[PDB]
């Protein structure tokens, strides 16, 4: 059995996380278990960098008016 964090979101973000896992963007393969098309299993020790990457992807194609 595994101990960690289940992450649920739209399939686009799941595919983005899979691309990050295969490209070693975070430096390792910590995206370990895939259970569903919209659910993934991730070790909680580095969830913060995943949030940072998601935020960077989100605000990259945003064109903030500030």
């Amino acid at each position: 059995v595994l101990k960690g964090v289940l992450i649920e979101c739209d399939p686009a973000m799941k595919q983005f996380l899979l691309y990050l896992d295969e490209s070693n963007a975070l430096g390792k393969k910590f995206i370990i278990q895939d259970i569903d098309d919209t659910h993934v299993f991730v070790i909680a020790e580095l969830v913060n960098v995943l949030q940072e990457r998601v935020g960077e992807l989100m605000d990259q194609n945003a064109f903030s008016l500030t």
């Binding site: 289940l6 992450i7 739209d10 973000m13 299993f41 998601v54």
Partner: peptide, 16 residues
């Protein structure tokens, strides 16, 4: 809704 787009649930997975 941007902040709540991602759902995280800490827990234990049984697959055995």
């Amino acid at each position: 809704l941007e902040r709540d787009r991602l759902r995280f649930t800490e827990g234990v997975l049984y697959n055995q």
